[PDB]
Structure formats: structure tokens, C-alpha cells
Amino acid sequence: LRYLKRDNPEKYYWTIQKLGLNDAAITDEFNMDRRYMQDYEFF
Amino acid sequence: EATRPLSKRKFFAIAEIIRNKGQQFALYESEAQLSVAKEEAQKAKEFLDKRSVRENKTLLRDIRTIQDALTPKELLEIKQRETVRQLLQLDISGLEVNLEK
Amino acid sequence: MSQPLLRNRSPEESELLKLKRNYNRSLLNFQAHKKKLNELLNLYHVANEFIVT
Amino acid sequence: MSLVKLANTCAHLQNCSKVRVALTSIPYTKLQLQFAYNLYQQGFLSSLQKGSTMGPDKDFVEVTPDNISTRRLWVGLKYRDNKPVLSSCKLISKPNSRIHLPMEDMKKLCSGVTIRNIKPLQPGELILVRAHNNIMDINEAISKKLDGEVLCRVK
Amino acid sequence: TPFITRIMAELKEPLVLSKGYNIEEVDKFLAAIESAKREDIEKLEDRREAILRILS
Amino acid sequence: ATLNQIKRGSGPPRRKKISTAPQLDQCPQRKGVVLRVMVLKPKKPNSAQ
Amino acid sequence: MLYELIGLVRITNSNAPKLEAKELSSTIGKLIIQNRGVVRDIVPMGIRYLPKIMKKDQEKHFRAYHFLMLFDSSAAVQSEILRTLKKDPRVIRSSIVKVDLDKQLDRASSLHRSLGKKSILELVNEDYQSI
RNA sequence: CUAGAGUAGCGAAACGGAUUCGAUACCCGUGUAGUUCUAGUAGUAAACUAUGAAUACAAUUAUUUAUAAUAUAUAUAUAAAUAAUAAAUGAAAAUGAAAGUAUUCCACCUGAAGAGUACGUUAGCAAUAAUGAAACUCAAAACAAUAGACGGUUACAG
RNA sequence: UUAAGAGUUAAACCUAGCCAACGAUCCAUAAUCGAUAAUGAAAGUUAGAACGAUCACGUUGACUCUGAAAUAUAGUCAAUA
RNA sequence: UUUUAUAUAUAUAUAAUAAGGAAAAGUAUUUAUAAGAA
Ligand SMILES: [Mg+2]
Ligand SMILES: [Mg+2]
Ligand SMILES: [Mg+2]
Ligand SMILES: [Mg+2]
Ligand SMILES: [Mg+2]
Ligand SMILES: [Mg+2]
Ligand SMILES: [Mg+2]
Ligand SMILES: [Mg+2]
Ligand SMILES: [Mg+2]
Ligand SMILES: [Mg+2]
Ligand SMILES: [Mg+2]
Ligand SMILES: [Mg+2]
Ligand SMILES: [Mg+2]
Ligand SMILES: [Mg+2]
Ligand SMILES: [Mg+2]
Ligand SMILES: [Mg+2]
Ligand SMILES: [Mg+2]
Ligand SMILES: [Mg+2]
Ligand SMILES: [Mg+2]
Ligand SMILES: [Mg+2]
Ligand SMILES: [Mg+2]
Ligand SMILES: [Mg+2]
Ligand SMILES: [Mg+2]
Ligand SMILES: [Mg+2]
Ligand SMILES: [Mg+2]
To answer: Which subunits count as partners of chain C given 3+ CB pairs below 8 Å?
Structure first.
């Protein structure tokens, strides 16, 4: 999705909106650390 | 570009924007939101319609009744609901003719 | 050394190539679906032995 | 223009010289073709040929995007007096450190003076320079008064 | 998110068949086979139900 | 050994000549007062007073 | 999913060994069909002495009526069938194994497949099966 | 290590029996924690291939291993694993498709000992884990291989 | 207010920002440099005595007049002697 | 190779045929410079 942003920004925003995600969720560094699983209540 | 001191730490001012990628990234965002809403609504309408069709919902028995006929009233009702060939024409034939084309 | 390395594909050549590729895709899809229909027919031929009642 | 690919080609030619194969294949690109032509003009390579991944072209084949992936440039190596003519092939300007020299520094390098830790040109050696997407020997680039990127050494 | 919910719903609808089969297509194919053979109704319905259960 | 590792501070150790007479504070010599005169025994294989 | 069940039913009545296997087959088949299942085949293996004097609950068994059931069904009711089998005193031993249907929709049991008959269509032979 | 349950065998510690100049050890008996399960803390091993990852190339043989064919036979072709090698490299042992020819990135090292020690800081319920010196002493210290001696080192003969 | 910009200083009202593991903030140390000196094949490394350029200081700290320019080796006040 | 022939259904299988030969005498400055030993 970051490549899609670098290539076709309009389709990038369309796709992330359709999939239920935002720009921050794609661009920001992400690890499935215990902090994420606690904050978002994965379990 | 260089400028008089405008604050403690600010000594430069923008002069022009060669690439408007940052500007476009918000216009496209809003447009994507607006378009996704309407496309969602349309596809949800289609799904609800299909649910209604499946709610409304015997082809073998019906076709056999037409075949044996070749009684009159039920036959007419089934007609409203080579005719056997038309009612059983399969999408695979369309694929075959398209491939040949 | 100072001339183009390759000859660019014309739009007409690209159209013909795309038509060939689409035909290949649709052909493979067709054999897949027809094989699936054949398996369905073979299963129908033996559905009588299967107990559902 | 990948300097990585030129390094790979240099190592490939060195390996081929060690095992003494009479023919070898390298990627078919403008930079590689110009580099091979420059080596051939100096006499380091016996022959240039255009071909596929399997071998030289039996008949002339036009180069198009359809077959570009499978195109190769086949070079014939020379072994004279029980010694390889093309013995060592190295890079001066590496991808991590790229060296662009002005003309006067290029003359100084040819004249025995070490410039930016590059060993000076040796008598029977050839140094290749790239200027305006054209590959030439250092002497020509000096005669053309062109500032350029100093790529490789062939001794 | 509308898209994931729609896809999950369509998966969870009744009379959804696996292995790339479509219920209407299967019914039409079975009727075509019966017509071709013609050219016991509870037993034909039993074959249909067994096929649907297997492919459900 | 990599270029970026040399950039960050990697390189040959300095041939730094450590001072063998630190207490003089980089002076050719210093005046002093004798606290005691001591007679030591040298390390073997040397022997003397 | 196609599941092959191999049950080892106990023989208590020396005069009619098949009765208990009949009752068990009826129960399992009824469960499978009433929970949206299909019973493709029931292969009646014979009476065989068990390899050892196997023990279920307090009774000790030396022989058993072996039987096989090939049935297409879902995972949940398959686990339910297994649970009913394990607690039933009649079933000395039970085992359910998946028969994969990724390539061919119709497959025979392990016994017929080992004999050489890959499918049940081959089992019932092929005449006027090209319709 | 922290809570619960479990505890058949094994078994730190402990209690005794032997051996011994002495036994604080090896051997023997009873055996606590632990080994086990669940819910956690911690994040160290000779955590080793003592060999970071990716890419291009590099001469053979033999087996397998996995595919693709062609009619068991083509000692069939394409790949990877394994073994021995050529060149190459190396202080050598040796590596051998990497310890070779090249490119890119990261981590690490700068004599032995003091020392992974002290102090401080961070985290953990704690044991501890991470980070991590300096003074002083010395001309040492280590790796591979060579020839010897030696072994409560093997086998073969006389 | 200045001849002059600016949180430089003084006042007012808003925004939540700014720097930082490519090392902030804090601490220790240090006058800086050259077509100057030493050394090296050179890149560099060391010095900053002597020649030359810049800065700061004239026992310590703050402020004031004059002035174009001074917190002046001035004046006032205090500290030290 | 190329071209053509016969035969067979624009193409395929067989057979023949190949244009690349030119000669002549005479016409320095090179650079900067890295040594180890017990
Ligand atoms: Mg401002
Ligand atoms: Mg416990
Ligand atoms: Mg225990
Ligand atoms: Mg014990
Ligand atoms: Mg001992
Ligand atoms: Mg003991
Ligand atoms: Mg434990
Ligand atoms: Mg943990
Ligand atoms: Mg430890
Ligand atoms: Mg460690
Ligand atoms: Mg290690
Ligand atoms: Mg080594
Ligand atoms: Mg520690
Ligand atoms: Mg202002
Ligand atoms: Mg301020
Ligand atoms: Mg204010
Ligand atoms: Mg700092
Ligand atoms: Mg000072
Ligand atoms: Mg000073
Ligand atoms: Mg001076
Ligand atoms: Mg200094
Ligand atoms: Mg002086
Ligand atoms: Mg002053
Ligand atoms: Mg003063
Ligand atoms: Mg004084």
C-alpha cells in the first residue's frame, strides 16, 4: 500500500478507505507487539 | 529562500511549490471517502436485493412436467414462473462461443 | 552505440499481444470449469448409492 | 547503468579468464555493450556477438521488449602465450563510493599522480570513463575535455 | 468496515457451494443431464440433495 | 570495515605513546623531598641491593 | 468433508453378533443424515479376534465385529460423532480419518482404494455412465 | 522464581553406609526442591556450522533426493542435499560452490591479566540480565603445523 | 525601544509547539586561525611561543553619562587588597 | 546459403543449382614516490 501511495495516490486513498484503514495505519511503523495487543484488545 | 530574521529560528520563506504531492494527498483522501460511501451504498443495495431473491426462492420437477406434457393449468403457471433447452442453457456455452470468437 | 537498443512495441502489436494473453487466460478458465462440470456429472452418476434419507 | 551489473560483469570475466573458457555471455544493455566494445577495440576481447540466453544468434534478431529479457552479448576471450589477455578487471567508482573526476584530475591520474586514492594509470592498462552516458577510454575523455565518472580498470 | 462484512455475509449465505460451484448452474446442469437421458422423482431429488450436501 | 561503519568511527587504533612518567605532569624533572631511603631486592634472575 | 470411521463393536450375544453393529450403524448414520450429512458407504468388515485382550470400562474384550463407514459431513458433527462413539460401551475402539477431496469429488474407502478401485463409480462399475 | 494443582520414576540439598592417611568426592540407601500441567516473570547456553544476510559468476566426479519427459530402458535431462576434489584462497589445518572471484548493508575486534570485574544506570518478586571502565603489573600472550618425550593409549607380530 | 530585523529586551493576546541516539540538555576542558612552526611520501597529525589576522580582558560584578560606536584601563555603587 | 523443379495438402517433403581475388616504392619533457630492525 505504501508503494501504491507512491505510485497512484488517488487509488491508494480509495483502497485504504475501502479496506477500512487510514493513511497512518499504512505509513507508520508497525509491529504486533504486546502494546498493540493490549491497546486494541486483540484477545 | 533566504529572508530577514522572522523569528529566533526562522530565516527562510517558501517561494514556490514544484510538486504538489502533499496538496493532492488530501484532495484525493476526501474524494476517496465520498466515492467509497456511494459505492458502498450501491453494493449493499445489490446484496440486499439478492437476499430478497433467495428468500423468495423445484426445477427438475417443473422441467419434467413440461416434458411429459409434450395438466394444462399447472403447465401454464410453470411457463409464467425447445423451451426446455432455453430454460437449461448453460453459461459454459457462452464461454465456448466467446473463446471461439 | 549511439542508437536505440530496442525497437518499441507499437500500440497495435501491444493490442494483439493483449488479445492473445486474454485468450490464454479465458481458455485455461474454460478447461478448468469444464473439468469441474465433468466431476459434477461423475458424482451425479454415483449419487444414488449415497444415503441422504 | 547499474554499476552493480558492471561489477558482476567484471567478476564474471575474471572467472572466465581463470578457467579459460573461449566464449562467455554478459547482460545485453547499453552500458554493458559499450563497455564490451571498448574492451574489444583495445584488443582485450576477440569478438562481440548478439545472441539469446542459449547461444549466439544464428540469424539477425531485432531487439524488442518481447525478447529483451532473453538477450545476451557473447564475448570471445583471448589467451596468448599461455596467458589470458584479459587478466584482471576491476572497478574504480564503486556504488558505495562513486568517483567523478574533472579533466585536469584525470590528466593528473594518467600522469602518475594518485587522485582520490586511485592508483595512477599503469603502462599497459586501460581506464574507462563515462561522460554523457557514453563510455570511452581515459585518453579520449581527456582529449574531448570531458569531466566524467571514472568506472573501471582493465590491465 | 462495509467490505469485509459484505464478503463474510456472502460467504455465510445459504445454498453457497464450495469448489467454484454455483447453485443455479448446478441445478441447470442436473436438469440438462436428466433431459438428455430422457431423450422416481424422490430418488432424483435425493441425488440432488446428496450433491448439495457434499458441495455445501 | 564497511564504508558507513568507517564513517561512524571505525578505523585503525591510534599509536598513542602513553606517558611513562605521569607524576611529573609533562615536566622534564621535578624537585622533591626524600621521605625515606629504601633498599629493594630486584626481580629474579637479577640479584642486588 | 469425507470421513472414514473404523469401529470395533463388541460382541456380547454369541448367536447374533451383527445386532450390535446394526444398532451402532443405525445411530451413526441417523446422526450424520439428520445433521446435514451423507453416508456414502457402509462396508461390513467381519468378526476378528482383537490383537490383545483390550479393555473398555470394566469389560475385557477378545474379539470384535469390525466395520467401516465412509460419510461426507462437517467437522463439528464429526467431532460429535467421535464423542458419542468414545463414551458408548458398545464401541471398543473408534477412529475417524479424513479422506481428502481436493482433486476428485468422489473417492472410495481405504479398503477399496487399496484393492485398486479409486472411486465408488468403479466399485459399481461403468456401463451407461457416460450420460 | 511467583501462584495454584500434581508428585509414578529420576533426583540438587540434607541425612546415613562404604572407600581413603584424610572423603569434605567418585560407589551405595532414604531422599527435599526440581523435573510435570495450567497462568505468569526472566531473556541468558560450546543458543555452534565456534562460519550474519542478499545478489552475479565459478571446473569436475559420484551418489541420492524432487520434478519433467521419452520408449525396466534411455547408465535420460532439469534442480537441490551429501561426499571427494580442480582452480582460487589461506599462517596452515583446511574451505570448496564458500573460508573463491566481485557488489551492498549490518554487527563485532585492536596485547595478557586486572575483567565481563568494580561503580553508576535500566528492567525484574528475587536469583539476576543489559550497559561497562580505570589504575597497577608484564614482555609477554595465542593460533596452525613440525620432531620428540610421555599416556592408569589401541592393534599387530614375534 | 533602535538607524535597523528578530521572544534581544519590556507589555499584551493567541497556537502547541521546538531540539534530541547522525547524540539534545548537562558537565569537564580550551582563546581561534594562517600563505606561521614541527613532522610525514602524502592524506593528515601536533603547536597556537615567535611573524601576521580575529576575539576577549586591563583586580571582580552590575549599571550610568558622553559618544557614531563603550556596560570604556572613564564615572557611580558595591566586593577584594 | 539463395533460387528453382517434381510431388502432396499459402504451406510441406525430396532433387539441383554458390555471386564474396585486392597485388607497388617513399611519405625527450614519461612525471608523484611510502625501506625497516630486536
Ligand atoms: Mg516574526
Ligand atoms: Mg510451584
Ligand atoms: Mg516429585
Ligand atoms: Mg534413586
Ligand atoms: Mg577428586
Ligand atoms: Mg546419592
Ligand atoms: Mg522449570
Ligand atoms: Mg516472556
Ligand atoms: Mg550469565
Ligand atoms: Mg552471549
Ligand atoms: Mg557467539
Ligand atoms: Mg582467516
Ligand atoms: Mg552482571
Ligand atoms: Mg517584534
Ligand atoms: Mg530567548
Ligand atoms: Mg511576554
Ligand atoms: Mg552530548
Ligand atoms: Mg582558558
Ligand atoms: Mg583564554
Ligand atoms: Mg602568536
Ligand atoms: Mg587547539
Ligand atoms: Mg610572550
Ligand atoms: Mg573592558
Ligand atoms: Mg571589567
Ligand atoms: Mg595585577
So the answer is: B, D, E, G
